[PDB]
Amino acid sequence: IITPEKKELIRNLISEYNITSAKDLQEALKDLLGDTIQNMLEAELDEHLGYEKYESTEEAKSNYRNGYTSKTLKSSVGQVEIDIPRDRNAEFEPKIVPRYKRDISEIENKIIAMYARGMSTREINEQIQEIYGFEVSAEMVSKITDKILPEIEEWQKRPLGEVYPIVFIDAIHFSVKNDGIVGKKAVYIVLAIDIEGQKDVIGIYVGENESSKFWLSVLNDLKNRGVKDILILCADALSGIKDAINAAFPNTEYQRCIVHQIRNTLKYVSDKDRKEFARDLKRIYTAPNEKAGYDQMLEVSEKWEKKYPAAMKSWKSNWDVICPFFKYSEELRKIMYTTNTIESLNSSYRRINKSRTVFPGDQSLLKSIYLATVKITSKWTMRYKNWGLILGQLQIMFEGR
Amino acid sequence: KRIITPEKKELIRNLISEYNITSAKDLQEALKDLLGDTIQNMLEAELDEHLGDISEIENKIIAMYARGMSTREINEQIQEIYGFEVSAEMVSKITDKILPEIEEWQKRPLGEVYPIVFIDAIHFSVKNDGIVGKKAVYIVLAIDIEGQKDVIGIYVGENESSKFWLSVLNDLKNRGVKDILILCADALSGIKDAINAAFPNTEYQRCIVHQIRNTLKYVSDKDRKEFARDLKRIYTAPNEKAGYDQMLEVSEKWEKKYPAAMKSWKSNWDVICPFFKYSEELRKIMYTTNTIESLNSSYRRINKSRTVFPGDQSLLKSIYLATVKITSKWTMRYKNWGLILGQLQIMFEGR
DNA sequence: GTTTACACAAAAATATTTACACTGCC
DNA sequence: GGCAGTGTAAATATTTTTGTGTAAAC
């Protein structure tokens, strides 16, 4: 839609600002933005004082005009300089450009959207300086990204649904500086499916733990946010977690997430060229009943006890926790042994934090974690397939709930 | 003072009225919408003005090319800032503007003598006339008589013949060089023959640091720290025979759980022998790698765009842009060069 | 008369360096 | 081995706005 008023404006701009080339056009862009802002500030001053420049009024006024003061603005097309009007008693606050504000490009969110991508503060600084003209340092990037800390708290207090059929807990470890020592801390992401079949990160908790009381606090946080019943909760082997699970969620059948079993048994110690033969490990969870699964587990153990460090022993010891997986239907089995639904998150967090070698504090780590989390969950619109068929049977398994 | 004409004031008023500007974002989006196609068509006409100085928008696009961004990334950024689309043809026509600058940079007059010179290779895939081939770009970095390091040359390498190295050396000598004091390049096919053919008067020995890099080509994560920790003993040795003893020791001690890399050490030991003839400071300036691995790794930090290059000139442009962006702030020279000067003048008096 | 502009400090707000306490990488 | 990075808190450095006295415009 090309309005003839716009064409008249274009011809008038080309004429009055002496545009003879494209470079003339960019310099005219700068000059025109500056002049427009100066005109609108002159209008706002006329509004505040109540009269135009040198206009006589019969009623004497306690405020006279007091010249101008300079300020360099930083806009999208480049750096401009303007002269701001000035009242005598210094009473009026500008409306277009507030006091002391020199960033105009509304670049705030963009900088954040870069930090959420995984961009270094120095990378962001170099990019902004190169492709915008004005300079924004790294500490200012940190100060800009500090602004979503209230948003982070509002997400930490987000009201949750009443019942979540399936919940997974995953840990991702990073190097963070606590009390002046850089140690490995694990962040726990709580991903849950609701009654309709939608995957959504329900919670994020920084570890900073050396106890089981932390797990009870996490479960009480989830229970306070609005949750009443969990049907299936799957977490990794962690300190005092089963007791906390049965303290606030007793009816929840806690089973050990099989993808965590395949990772902790295989990936931690495994020849890279023999690594792929997890296909024989598929035989354990494609079994019809728990007894056939245990028999296939023993067979796979005997065939792979030739080079296993300590995996099949963990299978044997934790078979008590892996047992309830078989009572669920075939589609719930599918929802369980799909490693992509957890591994996707883990790989995305790692690929976004690839450049962040060491974090200076807990809140800095939380910032990136929440940003990557929203950047990932924004794209999740496909709900789990074959649902309703899965729902119809799981609601039979758990009748009242 | 911005003395604004009354017609300009009425024009600003008309702009505010047409776009209903009340905030700064209103003004910026107004200018973006109003003048998008204007800027686009002006630039297209000025680029097509070459048979069918540079501006800020074109400098910004040059920087976008410098950071190795996709054509779609540049398109998105320009559409957001100025408000018009930029085609890949437009990007190519804009970036061809620095080609005369590159011509000037490849014909620069060089100094008479350069104490230390390094040549490094970086390999890429480029498509010429529809054939995708592996081309290695060789960067020639040299330190001058005062102690300042600066990239002397950039050369595309075809099949890595000795004729190519001889041609590179003849280019360097025509640009003004007469004698090199120390030349250290990567172990390459038939480079020493060209070196002693075009600069015979001083026996240059190569691979002061490219050899530790070549042993680290198969750098295995588990065996990195201890292997470079014990390999520091090989090049910090006081004497040549002590160096050979440490070489055999490290070879026998780390041939376990690792292929037979050390053979390259033995066969090329004839070339590594004279390295110890240099003193502690002259060795330090060499084996630190602080400037060569820095250059190639900084190039790689911008190498996010792993695309095949559409021509030699595109690769050459990107390499020149990265090189000049590094050398602009890195032209600062290093200390303690007086002892190194006294040592180079003791070893090679005439220079 | 009346207003407005212009300086040049002092004051107030903002943005940029070390500074760290380490990590990964040939 | 060294060395180039990281995010940001503390410590500065920079820029903007403000008191008012005075020169100039209306």
**Calpha distance B113→B98 (Å, rounded):** 29
Give the determination technique. X-ray
CA angle centred on B308, ends B302 and B311, rounded to 5°: 100
CA angle centred on A31, ends B6 and A86, rounded to 5°: 70
Q: What are the beta bridge partners of residue A177?
A: A182
Residue B244, φ and ψ in degrees, nearest 5: -65, -40
A73: closest CA among A131, A33, A25? A33
Per-residue HEC secondary structure of chain B comes to CCCCCHHHHHHHHHHHHHHCCCCHHHHHHHHHHHHHHHHHHHHHHHHHCCCCCCCHHHHHHHHHHHCCCCHHHHHHHHHHHCCCCCCHHHHHHHHHHHHHHHHHHHCCCCCCEEEEEEEEEEEEEEEECCEEEEEEEEEEEEECCCCCEEEEEEEEECCCCHHHHHHHHHHHHHHCCCEEEEEEECCCCCHHHHHHHHCCCCCCCCCCCHHHHHHHHHCCCCCCHHHHHHHHHHHCCCCHHHHHHHHHHHHHHHCCCCCCCCHHHHHCHHHHHHHHHCCHHHHHHHHCCCCHHHHHHHHHHCCCCCCCECCHHHHHHHHHHHHHHHHHHHCCCCCCHHHHHHHHHHHCCCC
Query: With the C-alpha atoms ordered A264, A269, A272, A276, is the resulting torsion angle positive or negative?
Result: negative
Alpha-carbon torsion, ordered B251, B254, B258, B263, to 10 deg? -10
Alpha-carbon torsion, ordered A137, A142, A144, A145, to 10 deg? 140
Closest residue, chain A, to B69 (C-alpha): A127
Q: Do B24 and A96 touch (CB under 8 A)?
A: yes
The pairing of strands A253-256 and A229-235 is parallel
- Specify burial of residue B56 (Cβ count, 10 A radius: 0-12, 13-18, 19+): middle
Structure tokens at A243: 């007791």
Who contacts B63 (Cβ-Cβ below 8 Å, separation ≥6)?
A: A130, A131
A202: closest CA among A235, A231, A229, A227? A227
Q: What are the beta bridge partners of residue A176?
A: A183, A359
B289: closest CA among B216, B203, B221, B197? B216
CB–CB of A284/A304 below 8 Å? no
The pairing of strands A181-193 and A199-206 is antiparallel
Who contacts B38 (Cβ-Cβ below 8 Å, separation ≥6)?
A: A10, A25
CB–CB of B336/B122 below 8 Å? no
**Calpha distance B53→A18 (Å, rounded):** 19
Q: Hunting for tokens 């006024």 — which residue is that? A: A61
CA of A47 to C1' of D2 (A): 65
Closest residue, chain A, to B82 (C-alpha): A77
Position A329: which residue type? S
Structure tokens at B103: 């011509």
B190: closest CA among B219, B159, B213, B211? B159
**Calpha distance B121→A338 (Å, rounded):** 45
* Nearest nt by C1' to A175 Cα: C23
Q: Which residues of A touch B43 (CB under 8 A)?
A: 22
Q: Which residues of B touch A29 (CB under 8 A)?
A: 31, 35
**Calpha distance B77→B67 (Å, rounded):** 13
Q: Do B35 and A25 touch (CB under 8 A)?
A: yes
Interface of A with B (CB under 8 A): 3, 5-6, 8-10, 12-13, 16-17, 21-23, 25-26, 29, 32-40, 75-78, 82-83, 96-97, 104-106, 127, 130-133
**Calpha distance A209→A189 (Å, rounded):** 15
Nucleotides on chain D within 7 angstroms of protein Cβ: 1-11, 15-21, 26
Nucleotides on chain C within 7 angstroms of protein Cβ: 2-7, 13-18, 20-26
**Calpha distance B142→A140 (Å, rounded):** 38
- Specify burial of residue B24 (Cβ count, 10 A radius: 0-12, 13-18, 19+): buried
State the distance between the two ends of chain A, measured CA to CA, in whole angstroms.
Answer: 57
Alpha-carbon distances of B6 from A54, A353, B1, B158, rounded to whole Å:
17, 55, 15, 65
CB–CB of A188/A169 below 8 Å? yes
B185: closest CA among B135, B142, B124? B142
* Residue B111: how many other CB atoms lie within 10 Å: 15
Q: Closest partner residue to B27 among A16, A23, A37, by Cβ?
A: A37
Who contacts A161 (Cβ-Cβ below 8 Å, separation ≥6)?
A: A194, A195, A226, A227
**Calpha distance A40→B23 (Å, rounded):** 10
- Specify burial of residue B149 (Cβ count, 10 A radius: 0-12, 13-18, 19+): buried
B256: closest CA among B234, B236, B227? B227
CA distance B205 to chain A (A): 38
Residue B207, φ and ψ in degrees, nearest 5: 65, 50
Alpha-carbon distances of B298 from B304, B323, B333, rounded to whole Å:
11, 9, 18
CA of B236 to C1' of D2 (A): 14
A100 touches strand D (CB under 7 A): yes
| Cα atoms in the Cβ-side hemisphere of radius 13 Å centred on B285 | 26
**Calpha distance A383→B9 (Å, rounded):** 56
B12: closest CA among A22, A12, A104? A12
Residue A306, φ and ψ in degrees, nearest 5: -70, -30
| Cα atoms in the Cβ-side hemisphere of radius 13 Å centred on A153 | 4
Q: What are the beta bridge partners of residue B333?
A: none
Structure tokens at A180: 């002046």
CB–CB of B170/B198 below 8 Å? yes
* Nearest nt by C1' to A67 Cα: C5
Q: Closest partner residue to A16 among B7, B23, B27, by Cβ?
A: B7
Helix axes B312-330, B292-301, angle to 10 degrees: 120
Residue A167, φ and ψ in degrees, nearest 5: -135, 140
CA distance B290 to chain A (A): 21
B304: closest CA among A119, A174, A138? A119
Burial B268-296 (b: 16+ CB within 10 A, else e): beeebeebbebeeebbebbbeeebbeebb
**Calpha distance A319→A313 (Å, rounded):** 10
CA distance B83 to chain A (A): 11
B279: closest CA among B234, B198, B231, B341? B341
**Calpha distance B143→B341 (Å, rounded):** 12
Q: What are the beta bridge partners of residue A188?
A: A171, A205
CB–CB of A255/A321 below 8 Å? yes
B180: closest CA among B162, B206, B211, B214? B206
A128: closest CA among A112, A111, A115? A111
Q: Do A39 and B12 touch (CB under 8 A)?
A: yes
Q: What are the beta bridge partners of residue B126?
A: B133, B309
Q: What are the beta bridge partners of residue A184?
A: A175
Residue A348, φ and ψ in degrees, nearest 5: -70, -45
- Specify burial of residue B26 (Cβ count, 10 A radius: 0-12, 13-18, 19+): middle
**Calpha distance B337→B70 (Å, rounded):** 43
A90 touches strand D (CB under 7 A): yes
State the distance between the two ends of chain B, measured CA to CA, in whole angstroms.
Answer: 61
**Calpha distance B320→B309 (Å, rounded):** 15
**Calpha distance B344→B181 (Å, rounded):** 8
Alpha-carbon distances of B172 from A169, B74, B111, B117, rounded to whole Å:
63, 37, 10, 12
Alpha-carbon distances of A393 from A229, A293, A345, A396, rounded to whole Å:
18, 22, 28, 5
Residue A234, φ and ψ in degrees, nearest 5: -125, 110
CB–CB of B230/B254 below 8 Å? yes
**Calpha distance A206→A185 (Å, rounded):** 8
* Nearest nt by C1' to A142 Cα: D8
CA distance A387 to chain B (A): 38
**Calpha distance A276→A301 (Å, rounded):** 16
Alpha-carbon distances of A69 from A203, A251, A387, B137, rounded to whole Å:
50, 70, 66, 54
CB–CB of A255/A232 below 8 Å? yes
Position A393: which residue type? Q
Closest residue, chain B, to A26 (C-alpha): B56
**Calpha distance B229→B331 (Å, rounded):** 31
CA of A7 to C1' of D9 (A): 53
Structure tokens at B174: 């025509």
Q: Do B18 and A40 touch (CB under 8 A)?
A: no
**Calpha distance A383→A198 (Å, rounded):** 5
Who contacts A257 (Cβ-Cβ below 8 Å, separation ≥6)?
A: A168, A169, A234, A235, A236, A336, A342
Structure tokens at A79: 């750096």
CB–CB of A134/B81 below 8 Å? no
Q: Hunting for tokens 């100060």 — which residue is that? A: A143
CB–CB of A108/A140 below 8 Å? no
* Nearest nt by C1' to A55 Cα: C3
Structure tokens at A223: 């229970």
Resolution in A: 3.5
Per-residue HEC secondary structure of chain A comes to CCCHHHHHHHHHHHHHCCCCCHHHHHHHHHHHHHHHHHHHHHHHHHHHHCCCCCCCCCCCCCCCEEEEEEEEEECCCCEEEEEEEEECCCCCCCCCCCCCCCECCCCHHHHHHHHHHCCCHHHHHHHHHHHHCCCCCHHHHHHHHHHHHHHHHHHHCCCCCCEEEEEEEEEEEEEEEECCEEEEEEEEEEEEECCCCCEEEEEEEECCCCCCHHHHHHHHHHHHCCCCEEEEEEECCCCCHHHHHHHHCCCCEEEECHHHHHHHHHHCCCCCCCCCCCCCCHHHHCCCCHHHHHHHHHHHHHHHCCCCCCHHHHHHHCHHHHHHHHHCCHHHHHHHHCCHHHHHHHHHHHHHCCCCCCECCHHHHHHHHHHHHHHHHCCCCCCCCCCCHHHHHHHHHCCCC
Q: What is the CA radius of gyration of chain B?
A: 26
CA of A88 to C1' of D20 (A): 10
